[PDB]
Symmetry: D2
């Protein structure tokens, strides 16, 4: 339910040229053909040689991820993030109407700002929290730096996320697992699906458990 | 109101022995005294050689930091964190009593789970979010993975945190700034105060702005 | 020494990241004047310089010495794939002796060696090179053994990838006058190989 | 046959404490029977292997070749401080000639070179060492130029700091039979320099 766009990626040939550089086997190259694609996959997955995959870089856009899931995504250190800052954007709530009383319309309205999960009760509490947050900002005009303390973890964030193919493999493996938080499994799937189809074969098996 | 402890640190002479290895200046060593300590500060502060500070490691324990602050601390990638997981530890609320009504007694009780800031209205909302979370967990027995979504960012976390001196200088410079969140400025001062007095000269200027 | 930029991230990737933090998309100009200056002004504030990490550059580097390779590999926030001596020394099993040290064998020698501005050093490098050739061809010694007699002037070849924030750091450190000369040359060749459009983010790094 | 010393290490109880911090389960703790096995168990779950990063090791390595240095430098999650050839090469300016090659001078050349399992290679290293010595002593050529004539068997000295998680990776990769012999030697030496109590964390890494 969160939106992931791959905005830029590294042509695969960058990877195969890199691999051939090591053993100087350009003679065996087929000018970016299927044998070159095959090479990235086979060598890229020998552990000692997985650093060749680092030459492939992906620039993503992620919309509608919860702050709670951001906590976990942030722990993958081999990546670059630029994240919508609550310290400077919370005033977005100053302008909206109350979400109380809870009812179908207000619950739909609140989904613009909150990630809902598959429990009605939890979602109701997130809206209650969102409403209190709205009041702090809107009626008492409290600063963002203080008000953010009342914000629920289901609050939506937005980010640019950039990551190389070797780190992306690690991410996909850890977060598509059944031990992983449901939202992180969805993020993993959404990131895979955002990849160009031509690159997806390098990652296809990370999601296999 | 938050506590940082330095559990273990690398002896200073470890860094001096490393500087003297580059240019083989082991001749002018003095068991780590004024000749060796002057060297660490002097050379390590030279950017092309700040690499020498990376040999010093600090193991901290940090108590009473909010999840909000944790989002910011997590973005310092050159460091190691082990964090109390809400996915596994939220059942801690299942035992305790209602925090309603919001009387003076229940406010203090709520402080054990929440970071309070310098605004009474914010804190009151944090406590309301806390009580809804307790209700989800205790009255409805909702699983941690779902309930955490209604958790407020003022919720307290607890972590083990290890960092080398070069990265710690960066962290202290960035988070003692006037532009950093108040809780993070406070963490910066506390990390510094937790350091052995002997080591503090390497970091004092980081705090000067 | 040959440096080529095979691929590079479009500038607007970085400007979209910057605008994401403060949600300032209304004020965008679609990778125009303002978007471009935004990347420069904000990317150079230290607390926001991680914005430049979204820009990635893929390079090919030919003609670098193993000596300078020692120094380039010390930049840890980068990716390299390097021609391996353990596997490619076989290249010497073919060629003809480089003795005597006449101008025809010296020329042939620069195929495999980085020469410096001293004729005597270069001659020593060629002599080390001929003994390496001797171990490989005449005695058929394993690569893993003969490689110990390799001179540090021996040429290497690598794919190198690095992001803008780390490239700023590389170019600053290595264009200094304290840097080995060959590394100063590399810094300059990397800058020169960047798209003209990106160069304004890096040129101050060279200014000492 | 290179010399590896562990100058300082982190107490094991630091990782057991970090591990317990995740689950708030210090209640069952003791760095006793539960703790040491806890570290080994949890550390080896890939999703929780970052608990091992709290353990840090400061080593000194003496007598490693420049050639092996190229490879060791490729492990980027570590800190190294290395004897600079650009400044310390003046060390050769004093010694006598290494020629002619005889049992005595071969022994003297070992002070400066790593020998491998072939006499012919070792002789060529000495030849290159002697030329290097001439450039420096007789021609008074600066280190920055002369280093290009240096053989990769030249010895280096370094301080090396690394955390348990990165060290496991290092030992696994470098103790392979696919690795350069010297690196396999180094992997064994690092393991052996570890305090006995920590070794059970790494011994499996050496087993292929
Ligand atoms: C199911 C699950 C449960 C989790 N539970 C917890 C928890 O309870 N508490 C908690 O604190 N965290 C928890 N985490 C986070 C976890 O500890 C990692 O920080 C996170 O998964 C990122 O993993 P990573 O280090 O492999 O990836 P990255 O940080 O992106 O690192 C990529 C690779 O680089 C290497 N690397 C990066 N930095 C270092 C370093 N400094 N030292 C050595 N090697 C390094 C490692 O090989 C790593 O695999 C959990 C993660 C998952 C998937
Ligand atoms: C006041 C303030 C406001 C902030 N606002 C925002 C915000 O609005 N949005 C947002 O997303 N973030 C924000 N941040 C986070 C900031 O962008 C950094 O991610 C964070 O502070 C960690 O800084 P660091 O990268 O220097 O440290 P670390 O991640 O620990 O890195 C240490 C050093 O290693 C180098 N390094 C590490 N990784 C890389 C890499 N991948 N590429 C190149 N070099 C690397 C850099 O030199 C860095 O200084 C803010 C930080 C501060 C202090
Ligand atoms: C003129 C010159 C002379 C030199 N002489 C010597 C010498 O005699 N001996 C020697 O050993 N080296 C020498 N060096 C190498 C130098 O010490 C660095 O290893 C190298 O320049 C790369 O610098 P860097 O760490 O900043 O870059 P990177 O390794 O790419 O790191 C980028 C940035 O990320 C951060 N970072 C990366 N890793 C860590 C880490 N683990 N901990 C904290 N922060 C980290 C730092 O902020 C760093 O600036 C020399 C370098 C120069 C330019
Ligand atoms: C037998 C053998 C043969 C080799 N042959 C060659 C060769 O022919 N040519 C050549 O160029 N190199 C060669 N190498 C070097 C190899 O490619 C690695 O650069 C080196 O082994 C370091 O491995 P590492 O990246 O896993 O370790 P580290 O650099 O210490 O990294 C530790 C872990 O952190 C993670 N990590 C660190 N940086 C990044 C990054 N930027 N992106 C994603 N993840 C990261 C990875 O998970 C990694 O496992 C060889 C190595 C071995 C062991
Ligand atoms: O190597 C490439 C090729 C294309 N694209 C991007 C540019 C466009 O935004 C998108 C679609 O491009 P085309 O399929 O039209 O080429 O993919 C890349 O990021 N890298
Ligand atoms: O599945 C998990 C569980 C925990 N963590 C990390 C993120 C936080 O820094 C800390 C606690 O996360 P939560 O369990 O509260 O989500 O550990 C993850 O990355 N993934
Ligand atoms: O002062 C700041 C502001 C932002 N961020 C990072 C943390 C989050 O990943 C993201 C948004 O943080 P908040 O503004 O919500 O705190 O940017 C910081 O690290 N420090
Ligand atoms: O200017 C320098 C000097 C040293 N080093 C690093 C590279 C080697 O790992 C080690 C010693 O190299 P040399 O001084 O021999 O070049 O220190 C550099 O990176 N740049
Ligand atoms: O076994 C190897 C082979 C290669 N490399 C890396 C180190 C060098 O940067 C490059 C080529 O090294 P040599 O084959 O020349 O040793 O690849 C290693 O680290 N270990």
């Amino acid at each position: 339910f969160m939106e992931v766009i791959c905005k830029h990626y590294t042509p695969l040939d960058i990877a195969s040229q890199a691999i051939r550089t090591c053993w100087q086997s350009f003679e065996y190259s087929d000018d970016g053909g299927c044998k070159d694609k095959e090479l990235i996959h086979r060598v890229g997955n020998i552990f000692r040689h997985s650093s060749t995959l680092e030459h492939l870089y992906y620039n993503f856009e992620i919309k509608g991820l919860s702050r709670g899931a951001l906590q976990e995504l942030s722990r993958h250190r081999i990546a670059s993030l630029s994240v919508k800052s609550s310290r400077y954007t919370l005033r977005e709530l100053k302008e909206v109407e109350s979400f109380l009383p809870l009812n179908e319309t207000n619950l739909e309205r609140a989904r613009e700002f909150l990630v809902f999960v598959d429990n009605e009760k939890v979602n109701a509490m997130s809206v209650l929290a969102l409403e209190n947050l709205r009041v702090l900002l809107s009626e008492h005009n409290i600063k963002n730096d203080l008000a953010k303390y009342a914000m629920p973890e289901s609050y939506k964030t937005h980010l640019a996320y950039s990551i190389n193919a070797r780190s992306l493999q690690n991410l996909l493996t850890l977060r598509s697992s059944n031990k992983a938080l449901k939202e992180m499994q969805d993020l993993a799937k959404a990131l895979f699906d955002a990849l160009p189809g031509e690159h997806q074969y390098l990652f296809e098996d990370c999601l296999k458990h």
